[PDB]
Each structure stands twice: as structure tokens, then as C-alpha cells.
mmCIF file of C-alpha atoms in Angstrom:
data_model
loop_
_atom_site.group_PDB
_atom_site.id
_atom_site.type_symbol
_atom_site.label_atom_id
_atom_site.label_comp_id
_atom_site.label_asym_id
_atom_site.label_seq_id
_atom_site.Cartn_x
_atom_site.Cartn_y
_atom_site.Cartn_z
ATOM 1 C CA UNK A 1 92.915 93.145 100.882
ATOM 2 C CA UNK A 2 94.513 96.459 101.933
ATOM 3 C CA UNK A 3 97.726 96.534 104.004
ATOM 4 C CA UNK A 4 96.946 96.121 107.703
ATOM 5 C CA UNK A 5 99.984 97.829 109.252
ATOM 6 C CA UNK A 6 101.829 100.975 108.144
ATOM 7 C CA UNK A 7 104.986 102.125 110.004
ATOM 8 C CA UNK A 8 106.248 105.676 110.504
ATOM 9 C CA UNK A 9 109.581 106.979 111.797
ATOM 10 C CA UNK A 10 113.229 105.872 111.883
ATOM 11 C CA UNK A 11 116.718 107.295 111.370
ATOM 12 C CA UNK A 12 120.168 107.692 112.874
ATOM 13 C CA UNK A 13 120.491 108.795 116.500
ATOM 14 C CA UNK A 14 123.418 109.024 118.985
ATOM 15 C CA UNK A 15 123.933 106.583 121.891
ATOM 16 C CA UNK A 16 122.024 107.864 124.923
ATOM 17 C CA UNK A 17 119.380 109.512 122.711
ATOM 18 C CA UNK A 18 115.722 108.560 122.424
ATOM 19 C CA UNK A 19 113.300 107.830 119.560
ATOM 20 C CA UNK A 20 109.627 106.892 119.221
ATOM 21 C CA UNK A 21 108.184 104.886 116.330
ATOM 22 C CA UNK A 22 104.540 104.515 115.277
ATOM 23 C CA UNK A 23 102.340 102.162 113.256
ATOM 24 C CA UNK A 24 98.733 102.437 112.102
ATOM 25 C CA UNK A 25 96.452 99.403 111.932
ATOM 26 C CA UNK A 26 93.121 98.907 110.176
ATOM 27 C CA UNK A 27 90.250 99.432 112.655
ATOM 28 C CA UNK A 28 89.554 95.683 112.495
ATOM 29 C CA UNK A 29 93.111 94.520 113.283
ATOM 30 C CA UNK A 30 93.649 97.213 115.950
ATOM 31 C CA UNK A 31 90.715 95.851 117.985
ATOM 32 C CA UNK A 32 91.124 92.087 117.395
ATOM 33 C CA UNK A 33 94.905 91.475 117.537
ATOM 34 C CA UNK A 34 97.750 91.856 119.997
ATOM 35 C CA UNK A 35 100.168 94.296 118.406
ATOM 36 C CA UNK A 36 103.916 94.433 118.968
ATOM 37 C CA UNK A 37 107.417 95.072 117.679
ATOM 38 C CA UNK A 38 110.303 92.999 116.417
ATOM 39 C CA UNK A 39 113.830 93.943 115.432
ATOM 40 C CA UNK A 40 116.255 92.402 112.951
ATOM 41 C CA UNK A 41 119.833 93.182 114.058
ATOM 42 C CA UNK A 42 122.698 92.889 111.509
ATOM 43 C CA UNK A 43 123.069 89.231 110.449
ATOM 44 C CA UNK A 44 120.590 87.989 113.092
ATOM 45 C CA UNK A 45 117.014 86.629 112.983
ATOM 46 C CA UNK A 46 114.347 89.127 114.130
ATOM 47 C CA UNK A 47 113.679 89.003 117.879
ATOM 48 C CA UNK A 48 110.546 89.961 119.858
ATOM 49 C CA UNK A 49 110.810 93.447 121.398
ATOM 50 C CA UNK A 50 107.448 94.527 122.872
ATOM 51 C CA UNK A 51 103.714 93.721 122.873
ATOM 52 C CA UNK A 52 100.429 95.415 123.816
ATOM 53 C CA UNK A 53 96.983 93.871 124.442
ATOM 54 C CA UNK A 54 94.262 93.823 121.739
ATOM 55 C CA UNK A 55 92.064 96.952 121.516
ATOM 56 C CA UNK A 56 94.436 99.075 123.667
ATOM 57 C CA UNK A 57 92.044 101.932 124.505
ATOM 58 C CA UNK A 58 91.726 103.382 128.006
ATOM 59 C CA UNK A 59 93.478 100.340 129.565
ATOM 60 C CA UNK A 60 95.922 97.609 128.518
ATOM 61 C CA UNK A 61 98.799 95.290 129.416
ATOM 62 C CA UNK A 62 102.296 95.836 128.053
ATOM 63 C CA UNK A 63 105.064 93.201 127.810
ATOM 64 C CA UNK A 64 108.782 93.490 126.959
ATOM 65 C CA UNK A 65 111.903 91.500 126.113
ATOM 66 C CA UNK A 66 114.478 91.558 128.953
ATOM 67 C CA UNK A 67 117.000 93.353 126.704
ATOM 68 C CA UNK A 68 114.748 96.433 126.373
ATOM 69 C CA UNK A 69 112.944 96.433 129.759
ATOM 70 C CA UNK A 70 112.430 99.842 131.393
ATOM 71 C CA UNK A 71 114.005 101.628 128.395
ATOM 72 C CA UNK A 72 111.375 100.766 125.772
ATOM 73 C CA UNK A 73 107.635 101.318 126.108
ATOM 74 C CA UNK A 74 104.614 100.467 124.001
ATOM 75 C CA UNK A 75 101.392 102.486 123.968
ATOM 76 C CA UNK A 76 98.448 103.315 121.717
ATOM 77 C CA UNK A 77 95.983 105.876 120.438
ATOM 78 C CA UNK A 78 92.663 104.196 119.666
ATOM 79 C CA UNK A 79 91.372 107.359 117.980
ATOM 80 C CA UNK A 80 94.109 107.051 115.333
ATOM 81 C CA UNK A 81 94.252 103.216 115.396
ATOM 82 C CA UNK A 82 97.958 103.687 116.184
ATOM 83 C CA UNK A 83 100.456 101.940 118.465
ATOM 84 C CA UNK A 84 103.834 103.404 119.487
ATOM 85 C CA UNK A 85 107.320 102.187 120.437
ATOM 86 C CA UNK A 86 109.157 104.622 122.710
ATOM 87 C CA UNK A 87 112.886 103.841 122.903
ATOM 88 C CA UNK A 88 114.912 105.650 125.582
ATOM 89 C CA UNK A 89 118.649 105.494 126.308
ATOM 90 C CA UNK A 90 119.379 103.873 122.950
ATOM 91 C CA UNK A 91 122.674 101.914 122.746
ATOM 92 C CA UNK A 92 124.541 100.966 119.537
ATOM 93 C CA UNK A 93 123.312 97.414 120.223
ATOM 94 C CA UNK A 94 119.707 98.511 119.432
ATOM 95 C CA UNK A 95 120.732 99.061 115.794
ATOM 96 C CA UNK A 96 118.197 97.080 113.786
ATOM 97 C CA UNK A 97 115.443 96.992 111.188
ATOM 98 C CA UNK A 98 112.317 97.499 113.325
ATOM 99 C CA UNK A 99 109.070 95.690 112.475
ATOM 100 C CA UNK A 100 105.529 96.136 113.779
ATOM 101 C CA UNK A 101 103.399 92.985 113.989
ATOM 102 C CA UNK A 102 99.834 91.827 114.717
ATOM 103 C CA UNK A 103 98.636 88.416 115.921
ATOM 104 C CA UNK A 104 94.865 87.786 115.794
ATOM 105 C CA UNK A 105 95.252 84.582 117.839
ATOM 106 C CA UNK A 106 96.437 86.519 120.934
ATOM 107 C CA UNK A 107 94.456 88.878 123.186
ATOM 108 C CA UNK A 108 96.845 89.695 126.057
ATOM 109 C CA UNK A 109 100.265 91.305 125.563
ATOM 110 C CA UNK A 110 102.904 88.559 125.778
ATOM 111 C CA UNK A 111 105.871 87.064 123.953
ATOM 112 C CA UNK A 112 105.065 86.930 120.246
ATOM 113 C CA UNK A 113 106.309 84.086 118.075
ATOM 114 C CA UNK A 114 107.147 85.590 114.692
ATOM 115 C CA UNK A 115 105.772 82.405 113.082
ATOM 116 C CA UNK A 116 102.320 83.334 114.469
ATOM 117 C CA UNK A 117 102.251 86.931 113.166
ATOM 118 C CA UNK A 118 99.312 87.478 110.776
ATOM 119 C CA UNK A 119 100.488 90.859 109.435
ATOM 120 C CA UNK A 120 103.750 92.850 109.279
ATOM 121 C CA UNK A 121 104.520 96.492 108.639
ATOM 122 C CA UNK A 122 107.490 97.412 106.431
ATOM 123 C CA UNK A 123 110.764 97.352 108.356
ATOM 124 C CA UNK A 124 112.284 100.700 109.324
ATOM 125 C CA UNK A 125 116.015 101.281 109.864
ATOM 126 C CA UNK A 126 116.932 102.565 113.313
ATOM 127 C CA UNK A 127 120.661 103.208 113.661
ATOM 128 C CA UNK A 128 122.321 104.109 116.947
ATOM 129 C CA UNK A 129 125.764 105.678 116.480
ATOM 130 C CA UNK A 130 128.598 105.028 118.973
ATOM 131 C CA UNK B 1 120.168 82.904 116.127
ATOM 132 C CA UNK B 2 121.590 84.165 112.815
ATOM 133 C CA UNK B 3 119.288 85.374 110.014
ATOM 134 C CA UNK B 4 117.644 82.455 108.209
ATOM 135 C CA UNK B 5 116.812 84.006 104.820
ATOM 136 C CA UNK B 6 118.959 86.472 102.856
ATOM 137 C CA UNK B 7 117.527 87.614 99.535
ATOM 138 C CA UNK B 8 119.161 89.242 96.504
ATOM 139 C CA UNK B 9 118.078 91.127 93.376
ATOM 140 C CA UNK B 10 115.263 93.618 92.685
ATOM 141 C CA UNK B 11 115.082 97.008 90.942
ATOM 142 C CA UNK B 12 113.529 98.993 88.079
ATOM 143 C CA UNK B 13 112.469 97.198 84.896
ATOM 144 C CA UNK B 14 110.597 97.907 81.643
ATOM 145 C CA UNK B 15 107.282 96.245 80.774
ATOM 146 C CA UNK B 16 107.903 92.975 78.918
ATOM 147 C CA UNK B 17 111.321 92.355 80.515
ATOM 148 C CA UNK B 18 112.698 89.726 82.916
ATOM 149 C CA UNK B 19 114.126 90.004 86.442
ATOM 150 C CA UNK B 20 115.517 87.287 88.703
ATOM 151 C CA UNK B 21 115.120 87.043 92.476
ATOM 152 C CA UNK B 22 117.211 84.785 94.687
ATOM 153 C CA UNK B 23 117.295 83.948 98.388
ATOM 154 C CA UNK B 24 119.593 81.841 100.528
ATOM 155 C CA UNK B 25 118.517 79.989 103.656
ATOM 156 C CA UNK B 26 120.477 78.191 106.384
ATOM 157 C CA UNK B 27 121.164 74.514 105.622
ATOM 158 C CA UNK B 28 118.797 73.479 108.409
ATOM 159 C CA UNK B 29 115.934 75.778 107.276
ATOM 160 C CA UNK B 30 116.344 74.958 103.564
ATOM 161 C CA UNK B 31 116.117 71.186 104.046
ATOM 162 C CA UNK B 32 113.252 71.553 106.552
ATOM 163 C CA UNK B 33 110.893 73.909 104.728
ATOM 164 C CA UNK B 34 108.964 74.566 101.549
ATOM 165 C CA UNK B 35 110.380 77.807 100.079
ATOM 166 C CA UNK B 36 108.026 80.409 98.617
ATOM 167 C CA UNK B 37 107.670 83.931 97.277
ATOM 168 C CA UNK B 38 105.130 86.533 98.272
ATOM 169 C CA UNK B 39 104.646 90.050 96.960
ATOM 170 C CA UNK B 40 103.122 93.207 98.366
ATOM 171 C CA UNK B 41 101.706 95.699 95.862
ATOM 172 C CA UNK B 42 101.409 99.321 97.087
ATOM 173 C CA UNK B 43 98.855 99.613 99.914
ATOM 174 C CA UNK B 44 98.064 95.883 99.754
ATOM 175 C CA UNK B 45 98.701 92.811 101.909
ATOM 176 C CA UNK B 46 101.415 90.386 100.778
ATOM 177 C CA UNK B 47 99.915 87.826 98.361
ATOM 178 C CA UNK B 48 101.288 84.340 97.588
ATOM 179 C CA UNK B 49 103.237 84.043 94.307
ATOM 180 C CA UNK B 50 104.964 80.648 94.038
ATOM 181 C CA UNK B 51 106.221 77.767 96.180
ATOM 182 C CA UNK B 52 108.780 74.981 95.655
ATOM 183 C CA UNK B 53 109.333 71.781 97.625
ATOM 184 C CA UNK B 54 111.971 69.046 97.611
ATOM 185 C CA UNK B 55 111.048 65.543 96.456
ATOM 186 C CA UNK B 56 113.115 62.295 96.511
ATOM 187 C CA UNK B 57 116.429 62.651 94.672
ATOM 188 C CA UNK B 58 116.966 65.562 92.280
ATOM 189 C CA UNK B 59 113.193 66.083 92.050
ATOM 190 C CA UNK B 60 111.069 69.106 93.012
ATOM 191 C CA UNK B 61 107.382 70.070 93.016
ATOM 192 C CA UNK B 62 106.339 73.601 92.048
ATOM 193 C CA UNK B 63 103.077 75.470 92.553
ATOM 194 C CA UNK B 64 102.121 78.881 91.164
ATOM 195 C CA UNK B 65 99.442 81.444 92.012
ATOM 196 C CA UNK B 66 96.898 82.053 89.228
ATOM 197 C CA UNK B 67 98.134 85.634 88.703
ATOM 198 C CA UNK B 68 101.681 84.564 87.768
ATOM 199 C CA UNK B 69 101.006 81.418 85.733
ATOM 200 C CA UNK B 70 103.447 80.514 83.005
ATOM 201 C CA UNK B 71 105.376 83.791 83.186
ATOM 202 C CA UNK B 72 107.477 83.026 86.282
ATOM 203 C CA UNK B 73 109.817 80.089 86.890
ATOM 204 C CA UNK B 74 110.671 78.965 90.413
ATOM 205 C CA UNK B 75 113.684 76.738 91.148
ATOM 206 C CA UNK B 76 116.075 75.655 93.919
ATOM 207 C CA UNK B 77 119.647 74.417 94.388
ATOM 208 C CA UNK B 78 120.589 72.251 97.404
ATOM 209 C CA UNK B 79 124.330 72.741 96.914
ATOM 210 C CA UNK B 80 123.790 76.463 97.456
ATOM 211 C CA UNK B 81 120.754 76.343 99.798
ATOM 212 C CA UNK B 82 119.092 78.887 97.510
ATOM 213 C CA UNK B 83 115.711 79.295 95.825
ATOM 214 C CA UNK B 84 115.229 81.390 92.651
ATOM 215 C CA UNK B 85 112.325 83.155 91.001
ATOM 216 C CA UNK B 86 112.775 84.120 87.364
ATOM 217 C CA UNK B 87 110.069 86.592 86.352
ATOM 218 C CA UNK B 88 109.391 87.128 82.618
ATOM 219 C CA UNK B 89 106.983 89.354 80.621
ATOM 220 C CA UNK B 90 106.698 91.752 83.572
ATOM 221 C CA UNK B 91 103.764 94.167 83.726
ATOM 222 C CA UNK B 92 103.135 97.389 85.666
ATOM 223 C CA UNK B 93 100.679 95.182 87.621
ATOM 224 C CA UNK B 94 103.706 93.208 88.918
ATOM 225 C CA UNK B 95 105.187 96.223 90.784
ATOM 226 C CA UNK B 96 105.669 95.225 94.459
ATOM 227 C CA UNK B 97 108.063 94.539 97.308
ATOM 228 C CA UNK B 98 108.917 90.851 96.963
ATOM 229 C CA UNK B 99 109.416 88.528 99.949
ATOM 230 C CA UNK B 100 110.935 85.060 100.129
ATOM 231 C CA UNK B 101 109.321 82.717 102.647
ATOM 232 C CA UNK B 102 110.045 79.455 104.487
ATOM 233 C CA UNK B 103 107.212 77.208 105.720
ATOM 234 C CA UNK B 104 108.378 74.398 108.038
ATOM 235 C CA UNK B 105 104.965 72.678 108.343
ATOM 236 C CA UNK B 106 104.195 72.371 104.622
ATOM 237 C CA UNK B 107 105.730 69.328 102.864
ATOM 238 C CA UNK B 108 104.556 69.711 99.252
ATOM 239 C CA UNK B 109 104.444 73.010 97.339
ATOM 240 C CA UNK B 110 100.907 74.412 97.477
ATOM 241 C CA UNK B 111 99.101 77.699 98.068
ATOM 242 C CA UNK B 112 100.799 79.364 101.039
ATOM 243 C CA UNK B 113 98.986 81.773 103.385
ATOM 244 C CA UNK B 114 101.333 84.327 104.989
ATOM 245 C CA UNK B 115 100.321 83.275 108.526
ATOM 246 C CA UNK B 116 101.919 79.822 107.986
ATOM 247 C CA UNK B 117 105.300 81.386 107.149
ATOM 248 C CA UNK B 118 108.054 80.643 109.669
ATOM 249 C CA UNK B 119 110.798 82.932 108.321
ATOM 250 C CA UNK B 120 110.976 85.942 105.991
ATOM 251 C CA UNK B 121 113.753 87.422 103.939
ATOM 252 C CA UNK B 122 114.245 91.200 103.772
ATOM 253 C CA UNK B 123 111.699 92.690 101.333
ATOM 254 C CA UNK B 124 112.949 93.794 97.913
ATOM 255 C CA UNK B 125 111.436 96.422 95.608
ATOM 256 C CA UNK B 126 110.537 95.506 92.016
ATOM 257 C CA UNK B 127 108.981 98.293 89.909
ATOM 258 C CA UNK B 128 107.787 97.774 86.339
ATOM 259 C CA UNK B 129 107.331 100.928 84.254
ATOM 260 C CA UNK B 130 105.099 100.872 81.163
#
């Protein structure tokens, strides 16, 4: 089987700055699974960040962790089978390895248990400088 | 919650040579899960490699994927809460990012699907040149 999720983007930014990440999904996964993002902060277990409903075309639900509400946003481009993670007003505390995830057992954007994730993209380092 | 798995090792190696992987887990996760190894060849989904489970006393049970039979040795050490994977007679075909896994539901080492994995260690590159 070919890799389901492929991540793009990352790097070092300054506090207050913004950065958007992206991830492609196979046609099949893009339409069947809830897709979302996780982040693995230094020395900590990866936490849920954001989720978007399955097959996010013209309309969809989005859901967020309290710690990123209003600052982070998830969206999609069905044409490119791609989902995005917009991160505004980054703080040093957002420094983490960012992971995209799919869960075929969910349809509506919600909290994702990492134990239930069917596929992961490769983690990407996002560093926010003080 | 602090990071459950922390893996070590990886790197460039010549065909025919050996390379060891190791991974630590928290005391609670180690004693509660079957530890495993997955690998993700370029452009592919992460495939099961080997699993190891604790049995009464000093005993363990080990299970290997057909692709890596005989050539790899899996082991674990309770005193250190670590699981090892010694890979021998490495081939270009073995080139992948290697992941250590913890499955809390499984009791005896057996084929492990990635969806059953509770925790992951940071991926580590292993490239085998001919």
C-alpha cells in the first residue's frame, strides 16, 4: 500500500508570526476519514490540535483544542485532496513536531484519539523563536 | 503527559551489515503493552516488522513478519524499560524510517496492525546502500 498522508511545510518563525502547513491524502482517505493535526512538544506526548469532517468539499465542520482556538484553523482543497493548518499569532509554546492524521472510523470533525488514527504523515518541525 | 516512547539509533549502512535500534518507554507503558517495530519504505505505508511480549518470570514471546525472518532479533529489558531490534544482513530493500510501537490491548506478541498502536516513538531513518 502507498503512503496515505504526505506533509508539506515547516520551519523557524518569530513569536507573533504566522505559518500554514499542508498535507495531501489519497483520494480514498480524503473522502472517507476525518483528517486532523497533532503536535509533539519537547518531552511531551503528542496532543490533538485540530480536526475537519470527512470529504471536506464545499462544506464542513472544524474542531479545535482549547489551546489553539481562534488562532489555528483547518481547511481543505478537495481538488488537490489537501487539508491545511493555518497557525496565526504563534507563541514559543507552539514549538512542536506537527503531525497530520486520518481516522476512517470518524465522519464529523471532533477530538481525535491518537490511538484511533489509521494513518500518519511524517512529523514536521515547527519552531517558534522567543 | 510526558512522551511515552523515545527511540535511539538509525543511520547509513552497507548491504550485508548490522544496525541496532532501541526505544525506551515509561514504566507504566512498558509493563502494560506489547512492544513492536514498524517500518515505512519510501512512498509506502508503515508495515509491521516484529513484536515482543512479556511472559511469566524472565520469559518473553517474539513474533516476526515474514519479510524479516531470521535476520532480525527483537529483545527487551525490564530493568531499563527498553526494547531492542538488532537487524543483520541488511539489504537495500530494508531502507525505511523505523518506528517503535506500543499496543496496550495485545497480550501476546503477534502480527500488529498500525491502527491498534497506542503510542509511537519518533521515526528514525535507516538507509542501506548496495
